[PDB]
Amino acid sequence: TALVCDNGSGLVKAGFAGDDAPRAVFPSIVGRPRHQGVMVGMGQKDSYVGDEAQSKRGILTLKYPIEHGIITNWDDMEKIWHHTFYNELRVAPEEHPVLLTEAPLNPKANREKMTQIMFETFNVPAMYVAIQAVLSLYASGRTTGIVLDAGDGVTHNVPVYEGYALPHAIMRLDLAGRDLTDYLMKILTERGYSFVTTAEREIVRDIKEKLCYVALDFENEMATAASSSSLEKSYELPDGQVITIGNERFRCPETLFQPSFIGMESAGIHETTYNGIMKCDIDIRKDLYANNVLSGGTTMYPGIGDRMQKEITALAPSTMKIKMIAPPERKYSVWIGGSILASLSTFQQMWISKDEYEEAGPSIVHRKCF
Amino acid sequence: TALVCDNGSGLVKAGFAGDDAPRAVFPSIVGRPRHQGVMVGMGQKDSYVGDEAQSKRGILTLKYPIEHGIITNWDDMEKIWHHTFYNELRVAPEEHPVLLTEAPLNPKANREKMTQIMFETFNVPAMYVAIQAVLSLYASGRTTGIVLDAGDGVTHNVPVYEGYALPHAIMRLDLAGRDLTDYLMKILTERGYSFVTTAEREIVRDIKEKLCYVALDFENEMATAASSSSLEKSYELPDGQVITIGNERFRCPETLFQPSFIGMESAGIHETTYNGIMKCDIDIRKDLYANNVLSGGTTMYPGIGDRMQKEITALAPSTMKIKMIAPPERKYSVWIGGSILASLSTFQQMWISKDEYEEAGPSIVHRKCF
Amino acid sequence: TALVCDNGSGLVKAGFAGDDAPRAVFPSIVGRPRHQGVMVGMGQKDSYVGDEAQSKRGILTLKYPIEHGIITNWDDMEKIWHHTFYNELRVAPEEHPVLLTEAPLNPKANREKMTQIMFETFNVPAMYVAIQAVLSLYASGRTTGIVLDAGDGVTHNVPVYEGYALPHAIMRLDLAGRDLTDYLMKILTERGYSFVTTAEREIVRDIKEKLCYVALDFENEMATAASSSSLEKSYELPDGQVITIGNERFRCPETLFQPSFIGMESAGIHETTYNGIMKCDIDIRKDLYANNVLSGGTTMYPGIGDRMQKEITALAPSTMKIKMIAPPERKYSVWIGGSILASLSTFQQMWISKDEYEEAGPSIVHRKCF
Amino acid sequence: TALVCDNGSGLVKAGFAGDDAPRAVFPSIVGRPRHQGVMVGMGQKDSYVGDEAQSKRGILTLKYPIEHGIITNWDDMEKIWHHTFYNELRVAPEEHPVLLTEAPLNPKANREKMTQIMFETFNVPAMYVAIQAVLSLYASGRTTGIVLDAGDGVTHNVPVYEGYALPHAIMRLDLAGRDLTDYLMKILTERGYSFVTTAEREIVRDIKEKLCYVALDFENEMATAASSSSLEKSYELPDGQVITIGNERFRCPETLFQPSFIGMESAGIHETTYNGIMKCDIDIRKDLYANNVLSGGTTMYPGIGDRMQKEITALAPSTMKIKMIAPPERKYSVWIGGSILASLSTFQQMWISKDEYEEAGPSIVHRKCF
Amino acid sequence: TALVCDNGSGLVKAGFAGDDAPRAVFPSIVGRPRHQGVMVGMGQKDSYVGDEAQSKRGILTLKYPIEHGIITNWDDMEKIWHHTFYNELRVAPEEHPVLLTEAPLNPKANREKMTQIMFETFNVPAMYVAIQAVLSLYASGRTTGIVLDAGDGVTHNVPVYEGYALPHAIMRLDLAGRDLTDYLMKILTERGYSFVTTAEREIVRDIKEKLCYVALDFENEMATAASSSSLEKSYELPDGQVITIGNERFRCPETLFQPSFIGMESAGIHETTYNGIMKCDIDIRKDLYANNVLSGGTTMYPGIGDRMQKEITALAPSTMKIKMIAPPERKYSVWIGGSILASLSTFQQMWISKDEYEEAGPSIVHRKCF
Ligand SMILES: Nc1ncnc2c1ncn2[C@@H]1O[C@H](COP(=O)(O)OP(=O)(O)O)[C@@H](O)[C@H]1O
Ligand SMILES: Nc1ncnc2c1ncn2[C@@H]1O[C@H](COP(=O)(O)OP(=O)(O)O)[C@@H](O)[C@H]1O
Ligand SMILES: Nc1ncnc2c1ncn2[C@@H]1O[C@H](COP(=O)(O)OP(=O)(O)O)[C@@H](O)[C@H]1O
Ligand SMILES: Nc1ncnc2c1ncn2[C@@H]1O[C@H](COP(=O)(O)OP(=O)(O)O)[C@@H](O)[C@H]1O
Ligand SMILES: Nc1ncnc2c1ncn2[C@@H]1O[C@H](COP(=O)(O)OP(=O)(O)O)[C@@H](O)[C@H]1O
């Protein structure tokens, strides 16, 4: 069988070919002990990875090896891959071909080094590099549609029509769930709650995950929040302290719609999708208007679909029918398509093998993968 | 039975001998993918033809194998014939005679290679090539008249009398529906609408089909258009943008009457018809004055008959009676006449059979066809 | 005297009649503050225009009011004109005639509104709208030639012969320096350099102007660039980081020769030039084959003339003599030739006066200018 | 001295009396610009005539003032005479007698208005119009012969014996070099080269002048041209494109001998000559059989004399001696012969002087000339 | 006139507008008796404040109501403002507008309650709250630069450029002089010097003020301290005991560069500044590299400027010209900028009026202040 290992910015999701649920979903963390070990009989390990690092975070310093989808340090990243293959899959890569995902429009050295690490360090029999939006489109059981995929680090619109993607219409924006978490950290100081280290960064991430939702409108929702207490909710910290939050419940995800909140110049995801489809040819825009496919955890907020449909309808011409595909299982959808892709017979000749590698050099991946 | 398959410049119209309507009418286009395919499956083809190519046209490049009645790309034309016989009519030509149509004054290699392809690639038992406008007149049940046939690529006047075609009088002008469409594409930029590549050319062709007409008097029509908005009309694109066109409706067809709009020196359709008549002998001119038979979709613009009647009447002698035959089904006359002409018993000896072809080479069609 | 003011897509170039070089050459930018001001002073303005906008770009959003030769933002364009007249040239327009240039086949409402603003907001004594390529041909001191004028937004070919333009042979393509800049941004992410903001677009534009060149051949040059680092050059960002670029030096302008790179379908500028020369009557092609006139900033790449001469010669017949006119000062050509228009006496009857405007409405610009 | 100004259908040949060559030999065309002029600083004229119009033809529409030996555009013809006198011969008209030429059986108003505008617009002291073929005979230095003269617009046979021309046997046919060129244009489309404008008509005339000849036997030459490529020849357009033409080299001339090619009911020029002899009395026929003299550029085709030998010999009685008189300079005959006649003393009693015109009106040329 | 009142974490500085030396500067201390008072007299007061409390610290317990810039105990700090208004400045609140300062990213209730108390308990005519870093930059007489302001409780980097702040680039750390003095306690225990109660906190603060300096590089300085007796210095305690300190001279402020010394995870102030500018736009970073402004008492150490510059040159790229602006009077820099703002004419329109408060509640001071 085959392995699908989505190395997202925040969460690594891994599984075998054909399965409907991932055998692995864990944060992409490398943790190192920031204080001095004093217990010899118990001892310590130089670095902790995955959920193991995620439980004892009170002592560790946490590093994301993936930042905005670009691999920044390869050492901790290969440690994360070693975890995935050995500890959690308990599998030997040498007898299983590996499928990897990646955000569109990324530096070539990135995929270069992933190929080199897979084939030399891990010696995979074959390996492929694919685009996350295409895999999400596969997961939707469709062939025509525009994928708006926003993970932890990257958001991107990729429109595909009758299976032909349009690279000139691909739009990429480096503003995603991690930057939302950072904005939540910056704004939670408004009510006197201070979080400065990565460990409490994870608390703020959990807060955004459990409490935040996307309002249908901004200004009237601001008025309602400033006029009543019905919108304030309470959350219990790991120490037992209780924090009540109000408008910042929805001001965090709305950064996806007004990047100006975090000082970015580009427009929101609605406007980015609109431009990414306007760059498309006339005859297909219709089919794209009714096939807005969403993927990644950043679009799991309650009511995001209704807000974004309202926005597009406002910018769209009145006659058109805008229909948004928001599957309940979309935060695994990018992974899910990989499971289908690895199970497709007509893809079995698309793997990049060791044989072609050793003759074509590392630059092979760019004349066999889009 | 027999097959009648008008390979017009823009639309292929095909059917069986004897019917009152062609079984399949579809645009003569060949589309090839212009982008890179990312969905791996079993539905993508190297090239798409016919209406199926017309529907996905946003993502294909469209080539017309027929230009000004001259067949330019033989491979694609062969593909279009394969589509017509095997998919639309679902017939095996090897057991059916075929009637083909051709514009007058054409390169001899064109019909020689048509004959070669029919006799070798498709193994047609016998095939005839007929002048299109002669067939259109046979449709109207006459033996006398001047046929002014304007298809998509070529316009031509042939005056005939008692079944005797007069070779010294045929007038051929390479100014027809495609050039009108291109002129509309050039002049639509006046109102800010841009249509640059092959996909939207079909859209402009559709606007020309649904909204254009020929003015009775051009200058007063400009006065009306620049004085009020009663002639401005709105059309919706596939993407919902609503375009308003004013004079643009009638400036496109008048290119048939003032070729100088597109830079052509040859005179208009009316004067071309008048010259095609005045090149004839005198004692028959009268019968041609009252039997102006029009055909081809380029002649379905509302008011073409009345305007061209005014023009010829102006050029004609005063005591002469000018009458024009404008069948509501004229854009199919070229086909329907063939359905008649292929059914006449007096034809059954006019077919060019295989046996004579194998002994006379490609040159036989020159000494057995007008 | 008379004022000539080329409103190019990227750079506005202005001066008085007779001078051999534009007095004011500055980019066409309106910049607005994207951040909230905290130092309460008297120097902060709602919008900055020209070089003063260029310098402060790190804190402003830059908009071009001109896109692809069609003006989309009217008010900021009025502001840019306010800069040109009052600050750069320091001139009162009320008593100097103004010469304005425009790309061919532009929406008629565009020059309609330019004329309206000139005759109402600035009340110019008179103004003429000339076609840019004609003025550039003036600069060459000729009367016959095919001008390929490519600025920041528009690439257009005009053939003229003994000074008569052939309107049916005009060719226009909305792909120019701006689109090359955008492509350069899209492909600089290949090496890990990310440029997303409007100010950073300007930096990529400077990169393009400094380190890009046109390759004589493309495949062999790719082989060379992938074989050695001799083509890789270094450049410093305004913040001092050093970037090394290899093949991306010559992949950026090759879009002018393979628009399929950027997703457009229309052919490259060499094939567009060939089609433009082909649409003309036969007896003149020879003269145009040896009078290929280049203008605009888009054609200052080293070696563009040699490559495009190679291309035309490959398409052109063997006997024909291909000669290219690439003056060193061609960037200002459209300007300097206009200076001749204003200084040539037999033209002071071609101005559109206020007096005839007040009676003929804003439509007068149409029947006195090509 | 006197002026000989042969106003042929296509080529005007003018000069002084007594010279052996015409000083001015230029095409009789008027060209008008068919496009809009944009070069304000170049010396455009309303119309170009003569070789200057010949050069700029690629941008001009060409009108021939003379069709079939009859001036249809009189204003253009006065323009052509103005160029002849003031620009080519650079001679003051009022102080020089002028000798004009005319084909027989030409409508009387033609010569009437010729004389009128010579005596009123140009104030010529005296002129003379003569039958062109009579002057052609005078060139040959004979008093006997049947002159066949075929110019650009008219072919005609006149028999003259001892200086007595016999009007009742004079034959005229309106089939000449112009219709030859038109038929050449019609038949060049068989190989796929299309010439439609007046400019390309001139190119086709040049191909006619360079590559056509008269075949001794038609069907033998058809067999030779259909069996081998020995007869094909290649010609180069002003653009550098190359045509290859085979049998069309000898089909274009022979419509002289088989007018049914272009649909004329009249017999060939050989049969017309034989009829012109046969309508003559018996006693003189022999002298005309051996004295068939040719003139006019339409008779410059190689092999015309031998072919006329063969055909007339086939028609004429066997015991009669037949002889072609084809001087190498016969295409100047109509001019040079006049130079002799205008210098003969016996002429200066036969000029139509101004004085007798002022009393006899335009009709004087009728009773003082043949 | 207007009052400028900086409530720093450790030192309160209050004065009038326009002055150059603070009329009042004193520790923000509230002291309460900790023992039983046995003498019956008129001098024993419930609670002591400011300098006079700093004198009686022996029998007092001291409380800072400002901890990390956020106000905790409102009653004692209200007493503090009362003492500043009445005993220090000897003025009445009701007839003098007041300007207050606040660290960036500070909770909502802090400044709402500050404005509340000012406008109701003290009845100030008008109040304003501004950002300390901005006023410190005002002190430098500049309009562009990144301020690093480190007081007793809060350090923060705020980059601004031509009066426009970049809120996404503001960096705040709760590590300042108070934490430094606590660290100095924690490390003085090695040499047997013990300081536990709040009274000796002032002693150790005086020690830190009088003795510590920033080493150019930490490690060679540590080797020097462990190798020789050149550096240790003697301080005279209030009780007469003398202490000699060595490496603890430069270990105390090194915490600002390596917060891991006090268990914090964040990077040092050098890396904090470099990141804070890296968040800003590219086109501006160079300007900020030359305009590093240090302010507050925490950057008064000898040698801090050289070490900070050295570190930044290590992190910053090579060519950059890095300049640190360290005015000798920076301890009051944050104050004096207010003395400008309160006196600046353009600012007299920015105050929050009592009239506007009585309608908008506490929420007014937020939509008109940054
Ligand atoms: N219910 C939720 N609401 C809001 N955000 C969520 C939710 N679940 C996950 N996320 C965010 O989505 C981000 C991306 O996770 P995922 O969708 O797996 O893509 P990837 O891990 O590839 O970036 C996570 O960083 C997380 O913060
Ligand atoms: N209703 C209409 N009005 C105007 N033009 C039409 C109409 N219908 C068809 N046409 C044009 O006529 C052209 C030629 O079609 P047709 O008459 O069938 O001749 P052909 O044999 O070239 O297909 C088409 O390209 C189409 O653009
Ligand atoms: N030296 C150069 N090399 C390459 N490109 C250049 C150079 N100078 C200018 N350009 C490009 O040419 C574009 C247009 O230049 P210009 O001729 O001023 O056109 P416009 O008339 O639109 O102002 C600019 O956007 C710039 O990117
Ligand atoms: N060498 C030649 N071969 C074939 N045709 C010729 C040649 N020279 C001239 N002609 C044709 O003869 C025509 C008539 O020329 P010419 O004999 O001078 O009579 P005209 O007096 O009508 O000009 C010209 O139009 C030209 O096309
Ligand atoms: N010469 C000095 N050297 C080192 N630290 C100092 C010096 N002077 C003052 N400090 C420290 O600076 C801190 C902040 O004082 P100040 O600059 O007034 O800011 P604020 O009072 O606004 O917090 C004080 O707690 C003090 O410990």
Author numbering:
A (entry chain C), B (entry chain D), C (entry chain A), D (entry chain E), E (entry chain B): 8 to 377
Text from the published report:
The zebrafish thin filaments in this study were isolated directly from the adult cardiac muscle, thus the native filaments were subject to any naturally occurring post translational modifications. However, the percentage of decorated filaments actin was ~ 10% : the dissociation of the thin filaments upon isolation is a known issue. Our data contained large numbers of undecorated actin filaments providing the opportunity to determine the structure of zebrafish cardiac actin. Without the imposition of helical symmetry, we calculated an actin structure of equal length to our thin filament map to a resolution of 3.89Å, (EMDB 17120). A reconstruction of zebrafish cardiac F-actin demonstrates no deviations from human cardiac actin over an extended length of 14 actin subunits. Zebrafish actin has, as expected an extremely high sequence identity (98%) to human. A TM score of 0.97 and a RMSD of 1.19 confirms the expected structural similarity of the two proteins. The thin filament is a macromolecular complex with a stable actin filament core and more mobile regulatory proteins, and as would be expected the resolution of the actin density was higher than the more flexible domains of troponin in the Yamada cryo-EM reconstructions.
Actin, tropomyosin and troponin, the proteins that comprise the contractile apparatus of the cardiac thin filament, are highly conserved across species. The main components of the thin filament are actin, tropomyosin, and troponin. The thin filament plays a crucial role in the “cross-bridge cycle” and force production in striated muscle. We have used cryo-EM to study the three-dimensional structure of the zebrafish cardiac thin and actin filaments.
